[PDB]
Amino acid sequence: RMKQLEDKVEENLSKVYHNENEVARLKKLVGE
Amino acid sequence: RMKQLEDKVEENLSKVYHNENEVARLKKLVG
Amino acid sequence: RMKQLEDKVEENLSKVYHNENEVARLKKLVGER
Ligand SMILES: [Cl-]
Ligand SMILES: [Cl-]
């Protein structure tokens, strides 16, 4: 059960890093 | 304590998923 | 082990929060005005 939660936590981390990088990429595309 | 942690993980996933969808929408606003 | 995982989850929540704020900024950048 703790192992199952650890997998879910590492997946959430993957997802957040990916969203962070997608935001950064879009900012680079548009500019102020 | 473990069920509190499981609830927090579920909430984090819900918030990540919302952010994902917001990013997708903003991409299409530029795209 | 559980304490360590709690700490990781708190860090993920921080990262989610920072991402929320960056998304809000992007919304202003790509919206009309
Ligand atoms: Cl998490
Ligand atoms: Cl996120």
Comma- or semicolon-separated keywords:
homotrimer, 32 residues, mainly alpha, 1 helix, binds chloride ion, General control transcription factor GCN4 (chain B)
What's the topology here?
Three copies of one chain form a homotrimer.
Chain A: H1 2-30
Bound molecules: chloride ion (2 copies).
Description:
Chain A is 91% helix and 0% strand. The first copy, chain A, has 32 residues and is mainly alpha-helical. At the A-C interface, helix 1 of A face helix 1 of C. Bound molecules: chloride ion (2 copies). The site of one chloride ion has 2 residues of chain A, from helix 1.
Strand content of chain A: under 5%
The value of Rg of chain A in angstroms is: 14 Å
Element pattern of chain A in H and E: H
Largest interface: A-C, 16 and 16 residues
Termini of chain A, distance in Å?
Answer: 46 Å
Largest sheet of chain A: none
SSE class of chain A: mainly alpha
| Proportion of helical residues of chain A | over 70%
Oligomeric grouping of the chains: homotrimer
Number of DSSP-assigned strands of chain A: 0
Bound molecules: chloride ion
Number of helices of chain A: 1
The shape of chain A, in one word, is rod-shaped
PDB class: transcription
Keywords: amino-acid biosynthesis, protein export, TAA, nucleus, activator, coiled coil, DNA-binding, trimeric autotransporter adhesin
Assembly: trimeric
Entry title: GCN4 leucine zipper mutant with two VxxNxxx motifs coordinating chloride
